[PDB]
Structure 1
Amino acid sequence: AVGACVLCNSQTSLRCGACIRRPFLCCKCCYDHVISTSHKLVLSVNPYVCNAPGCDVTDVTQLYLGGMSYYCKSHKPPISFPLCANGQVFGLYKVTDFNAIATCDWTNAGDYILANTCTERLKLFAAETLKATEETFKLSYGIATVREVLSDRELHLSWEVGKPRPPLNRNYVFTGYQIGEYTFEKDAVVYRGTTTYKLNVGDYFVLTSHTVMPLSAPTLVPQEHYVRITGLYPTLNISDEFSSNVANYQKVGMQKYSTLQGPPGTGKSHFAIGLALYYPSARIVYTACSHAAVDALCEKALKYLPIDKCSRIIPARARVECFDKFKVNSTLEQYVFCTVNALPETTADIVVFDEISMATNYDLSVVNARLRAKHYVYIGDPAQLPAPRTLLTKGTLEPEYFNSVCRLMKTIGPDMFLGTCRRCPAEIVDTVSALVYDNKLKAHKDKSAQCFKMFYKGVITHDVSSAINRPQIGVVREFLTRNPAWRKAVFISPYNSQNAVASKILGLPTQTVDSSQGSEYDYVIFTQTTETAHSCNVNRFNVAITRAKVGILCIMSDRDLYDKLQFTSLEI
């Protein structure tokens, strides 16, 4: 009931009862809130409500202190101060941007912009409010009761009347009833459970609405610049394999936190693991939001770091298959590999946060809150994909607004830039370099002469709002008959439904651009499917085409992005 003012820290008894997070506000700031927002309920030890029997006045602006008690204009005794006077609200110990965060629905880009240009304590209020709003939206969707069980991977679903139906992709994970987490794909729907259970008729699912704990730690601890490598002990014996990164490893030791922008295939994983071999005594916690990013860092560690000082942290509520080849849940091993939402309370000489474009400010805060560390290293690329903002429907979230790390990488620049792509044919490296990296990404590899583009708008059908372009898959099928080297290709599109159709007609393995991020394939077939803002997003486009080691076929809908592709054009 007595805490700190989320805007000026000042001690106060005053929470806003109208904010969903109920932040402590100081008298000077609590006024400036209630006098310019629909937010009028103020909380103290007791609520600022008229104390007269059967009176319903709760608006702080219509209330007075009557002795030690609160009354409205109609019930106040002659000797009474108004609670709102001279720019203050009476409490104990006696904002434009705070007002916009407190009252916004988080459906506009400008909301996320402001949640990332604001002060550091307001970034935490913002991140808390957003996540709370995100969760209380999941309740708004309808329950799914099973009508008929076809098989071991298909069923027919009965949806609740009046309440909307959530998108049926891998992004929306249901909880069955506690018969374990479950996902769906498109009257026959494809059902995939985190447990192998006899999925009964009349069993039901609901989206796992989790309780939003409060944030305490900043997104970014304050910066500290040192004169010498602090708390770390470098080798003089460092294998030539990691010689490129020695100057960057010494930057990491002479600062509190460092930022690494590594475009696709520029040696992020290599740099992360190479940090351990350069500071061989140092205890390192490797963390990312997804299980895939943490498992990728594990594969790289398996190759270069001793398996007996590596532990993969797996939360008891197991949701996906994880990296098996380390000791599981040994928190005190020199090398710990853990998703942000499973991080234990511990310390470390270096923390490496990877896939930073996928981190929210909520994730950036949790990390600083569970790990106390000499050095924090932030690895990713603001030109790759952000965490999905399920509430955002209006405006596009630019990369400088993804999180505080990406804002730093986009404003003042990253500390370290890996500038040579070793993965992609020059045609792909030259294209993305001009598109998202201001011509600063360089091609190691030669032009493959296996990078083709076809401008083919086709026909767009829709499985609800997820898009399909059968003619674009038809063009692919025709290409494959003449190009049997591509039979091994991964099919990629911005749409699950397009992928579903492509799986059946082509037989190729299938990835959404978003699920493809971090992965690499010899040959890639990309159908843009539509020319919407989703499919023309330059970040998503950048990821789509940089998955390819040898060849790529791009069937394009967008004249703009088609023209920019420095690929051999095809006909038909």
Structure 2
Amino acid sequence: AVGACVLCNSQTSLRCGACIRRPFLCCKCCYDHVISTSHKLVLSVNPYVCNAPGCDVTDVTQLYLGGMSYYCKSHKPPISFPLCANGQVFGLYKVTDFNAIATCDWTNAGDYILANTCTERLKLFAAETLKATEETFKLSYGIATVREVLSDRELHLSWEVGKPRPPLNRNYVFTGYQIGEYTFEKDAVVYRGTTTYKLNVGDYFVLTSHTVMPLSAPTLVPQEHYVRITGLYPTLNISDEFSSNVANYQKVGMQKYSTLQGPPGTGKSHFAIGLALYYPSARIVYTACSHAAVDALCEKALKYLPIDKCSRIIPARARVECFDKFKVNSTLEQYVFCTVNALPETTADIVVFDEISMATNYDLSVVNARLRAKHYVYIGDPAQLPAPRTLLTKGTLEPEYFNSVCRLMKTIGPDMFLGTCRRCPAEIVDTVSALVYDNKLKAHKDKSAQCFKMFYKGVITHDVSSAINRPQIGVVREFLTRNPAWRKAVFISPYNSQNAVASKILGLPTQTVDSSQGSEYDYVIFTQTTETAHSCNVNRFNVAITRAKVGILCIMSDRDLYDKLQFTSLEI
């Protein structure tokens, strides 16, 4: 009932009752909030409501104090002070940006821009309000009842009438009834159970709606610069493999936190694991939002770090199969690999937060709350894909607004930059270097002469809103017959429905651009499918073409991105 103001920290008994997160607001800030917004309900020990029997006056601007009680203009006694006077709301211990965060629906890009350009306390308020709004929105979709079970991976579904149907992709995870977590892909629908269960008819699936806990810690702790490496002890015997990062490792020990921008295949995992070899006594917690990113760090650690000092932290409510080679849930091992939502309450000499473009400010703050560290290292690339913003429908979210770390990397620049791409053929490196890296990314490999582009719009059909381009898949099939080395290629597109069609017609393994992030393949076949803002996003385009080690075939819809591809053009 009593606490600190989310705008100026001033102690108060006031909480805004119309805010979904009921933030503590001081007399001055509470007034400036209620007078400028539709939010008029204020809560101290008791709510600011008219104490007269049967009276429904809840608006703090229409209320007064009659001794110790509160009454409206129609019930107040002769000796009564208006609650809203002289720029203040009466209570105990006697903002334009806060108003917009407190009242927005989170469907505009300007909402996310503000949630990142505001003060540190408003970034936490915005991140809590957003996540709570995203969860209360999950209650809007319809329930799925099972109609017929055809196979162990296919079924028919009956949807709730009157309530919209959720997009059927891997992003939407349903909880079935407790029969385990389940996912769906497109009359026949493909089912994937986290737990293997004999799918019963009539059984129902509902999207998992979880409680949003409040944020305490900042997204970024206050920066500290040191004259010497602090609390870390370097080797003198450091392997030549990691010699290239020694200056950067020293920078890591001379700052409270550091940012590393690593374009595709420039050495992010190598840098992250090498930091352990450079400070061999240091306890390092390796974290990321996804299980795939945490597993990719375990893969690199398995190669260089001692297996007995590693532990993979796996939450008991296991949703996907993850890294099985380290001792599980041994929180006290020198090297702890764990997703952000599973982090324990612990300390560390270094915390490495990988795939930073995927993190939200909610995740940035959670890490600072669970982990007390001497040093924090943020590794990622603001030119890669951010976390999906399910509520955002109007406007495009620029990289400087993905989270606080990404904002710093795009404004003041990253502290460290891995400038040499060792994965991609030079055609790909030169294309993305000009596109998203200001011509600062360099190619280690030569031009492979196996990078092709085809300008082919085809025909766009739609599975609900997920797009399909059968003529683009037909062009791929003709190319495959003439280029049999490409049999081993991974098929990539911005749409899961395009991928489902390509899987049946081509038989190639499939991946969306968003699920391909962090992975690499010898050959990639990419069909743009449409000319939407989604398929034309330069960050998605960057991730798509940088998956290839040897060759890439790009069947393009957009003239702009097609012309920017420094690939050999093909006819038909």
Residues 329-351 of structure 1, C-alpha deviation per residue, up to 9 Å, x if partnerless?
Answer: 00000000000000000000000
Residues 443-501 of structure 1, C-alpha deviation per residue, up to 9 Å, x if partnerless?
Answer: 00000000000000000000000000000000000000000000000000000000000
SS at the partner of 2:124? helix
**Distance (Å, rounded) in 1 between the aligned partners of 2:149 and 2:3:** 54
Other-structure match for 2:177: 177
**Distance (Å, rounded) in 2 between the aligned partners of 1:330 and 1:290:** 19
**Distance (Å, rounded) in 1 between the aligned partners of 2:468 and 2:145:** 27
Instruction: Compute the displacement of 1:272 (Å).
Output: 0.1
Residues 409-429 of structure 1, C-alpha deviation per residue, up to 9 Å, x if partnerless?
Answer: 000000000000000000000
Q: Does 1:329 align with 2:329?
A: yes
**Distance (Å, rounded) in 2 between the aligned partners of 1:430 and 1:113:** 30
**Distance (Å, rounded) in 2 between the aligned partners of 1:203 and 1:54:** 46
Instruction: Compute the displacement of 1:278 (Å).
Output: 0.2
**Distance (Å, rounded) in 1 between the aligned partners of 2:326 and 2:395:** 43
Q: Does 1:295 align with 2:295?
A: yes
Other-structure match for 2:60: 60
Residues 353-400 of structure 1, C-alpha deviation per residue, up to 9 Å, x if partnerless?
Answer: 000000000000000000000000000000000000000000000000
Instruction: Compute the displacement of 1:180 (Å).
Output: 0.5
- When normalised by structure 1's length, the TM-score is 1.00
**Distance (Å, rounded) in 2 between the aligned partners of 1:288 and 1:193:** 24
**Distance (Å, rounded) in 1 between the aligned partners of 2:492 and 2:546:** 12
**Distance (Å, rounded) in 2 between the aligned partners of 1:521 and 1:346:** 37
**Distance (Å, rounded) in 2 between the aligned partners of 1:128 and 1:436:** 31
Residues 203-259 of structure 1, C-alpha deviation per residue, up to 9 Å, x if partnerless?
Answer: 101000000000000000000000000000000000000000000000000000000
**Distance (Å, rounded) in 2 between the aligned partners of 1:431 and 1:251:** 31
Other-structure match for 1:427: 427
**Distance (Å, rounded) in 1 between the aligned partners of 2:355 and 2:16:** 36
Instruction: Compute the displacement of 1:182 (Å).
Output: 0.1
Residues 109-150 of structure 1, C-alpha deviation per residue, up to 9 Å, x if partnerless?
Answer: 000000000000000000000000000000000000101111
SS at the partner of 2:78? coil
Residues 38-91 of structure 1, C-alpha deviation per residue, up to 9 Å, x if partnerless?
Answer: 000000000000000000000000000001000000000000000000000000
Instruction: Compute the displacement of 1:530 (Å).
Output: 0.2
SS at the partner of 1:321? coil
**Distance (Å, rounded) in 1 between the aligned partners of 2:447 and 2:154:** 44
SS at the partner of 1:110? helix
SS at the partner of 2:10? strand
Q: Does 1:538 align with 2:538?
A: yes
**Distance (Å, rounded) in 2 between the aligned partners of 1:171 and 1:426:** 33
Tell me the number of residue pairs that the alignment of Structure 1 and Structure 2 aligns: 572
**Distance (Å, rounded) in 2 between the aligned partners of 1:9 and 1:414:** 31
Q: Percent identity?
A: 100
**Distance (Å, rounded) in 1 between the aligned partners of 2:8 and 2:19:** 17
Instruction: Compute the displacement of 1:187 (Å).
Output: 1.4
Instruction: Compute the displacement of 1:291 (Å).
Output: 0.2
SS at the partner of 1:549? strand
SS at the partner of 2:217? coil
Instruction: Compute the displacement of 1:566 (Å).
Output: 0.2
Residues 141-191 of structure 1, C-alpha deviation per residue, up to 9 Å, x if partnerless?
Answer: 000010111110000000000000000000000000111000000011000
**Distance (Å, rounded) in 1 between the aligned partners of 2:469 and 2:92:** 64
**Distance (Å, rounded) in 2 between the aligned partners of 1:415 and 1:69:** 57
Unaligned runs of 5+ in 1: none
Instruction: Compute the displacement of 1:19 (Å).
Output: 0.2
**Distance (Å, rounded) in 1 between the aligned partners of 2:444 and 2:199:** 51
**Distance (Å, rounded) in 1 between the aligned partners of 2:493 and 2:297:** 26
Tell me how large the CA RMSD over aligned residues is: 0.2
Structure 1 residue ranges, 4+ long, deviating more than 2 angstroms after superposition = none
Unaligned runs of 5+ in 2: none
**Distance (Å, rounded) in 1 between the aligned partners of 2:207 and 2:213:** 18
**Distance (Å, rounded) in 1 between the aligned partners of 2:186 and 2:511:** 15
**Distance (Å, rounded) in 1 between the aligned partners of 2:459 and 2:13:** 61
- When normalised by structure 2's length, the TM-score is 1.00
**Distance (Å, rounded) in 2 between the aligned partners of 1:556 and 1:322:** 35
Q: Does 1:99 align with 2:80?
A: no
Q: How does 1:509-524 map to 2 (within 5 A)?
A: 509-524=509-524
